[PDB]
Design a protein around this ligand. Structure first.
Ligand SMILES: O=C(O)COc1ccc(F)cc1
Length: 185
């Protein structure tokens, strides 16, 4: 792909984080802690899952960023509406305001309803995410495999400002402690 020139500097919004997440000083990395991180509750925090939003809001234009997923067993990545539900249980779907892919139990899937199987020969260590607001497109790229396409959501109905979306996943296994990291431009 040739989307690299739309690169944006994403930072994580501490206030939206689940209370177990640990965000680095530079706001570019996030991981699951082994306990509650001693923060106050607020209406922005994702309560049920280890999720956090980027601080940046997008309502026009073309945007690109990259995320490091090295040695993780489970994660979700993409974008979402600013007004997505924070509290209780929900599924990641465009109907609920999410445009995402994930790794889970050694398979990759796109967060359609129902979910769509992805075909990845080279397990990615870094994911590229491209958003074209005007066109209604969200695309995912395998940076480990020379930028090959993973998935395109088209005919997107964003219906609001968009925020970068992250889920570090649970660590029931002891094999999923590694962070998500925003990669430098
Ligand atoms: O199940 C655990 O690992 C600890 O409890 C949590 C439950 C839901 C969360 F979003 C974060 C932590």
């Amino acid at each position: 792909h040739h989307h690299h020139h739309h690169m944006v500097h994403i930072t994580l919004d501490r206030n939206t984080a689940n209370s177990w997440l640990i965000i680095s000083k530079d706001r570019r990395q996030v991981r699951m802690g082994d306990t509650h991180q001693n923060v106050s509750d607020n209406k922005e925090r994702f309560s049920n899952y280890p999720m956090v939003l980027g601080a940046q809001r997008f309502s026009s234009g073309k945007m690109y960023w990259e995320v490091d997923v090295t040695q993780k067993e489970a994660w979700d990545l993409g974008v979402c509406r600013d007004s997505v539900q924070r509290k209780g249980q929900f599924s990641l779907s465009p109907e609920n305001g999410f445009w995402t892919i994930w790794l889970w139990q050694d398979s990759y899937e796109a967060g359609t309803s129902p979910q769509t199987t992805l075909h990845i020969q080279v397990p990615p260590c870094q994911i590229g995410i491209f958003v074209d607001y005007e066109a209604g497109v969200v695309s995912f790229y395998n940076i480990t495999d020379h930028g090959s396409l993973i998935y395109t959501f088209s005919e997107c109905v964003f219906a609001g400002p968009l925020r970068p979306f992250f889920n570090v996943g649970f660590n029931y296994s002891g094999g999923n402690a590694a962070p998500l990291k925003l990669c430098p431009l």
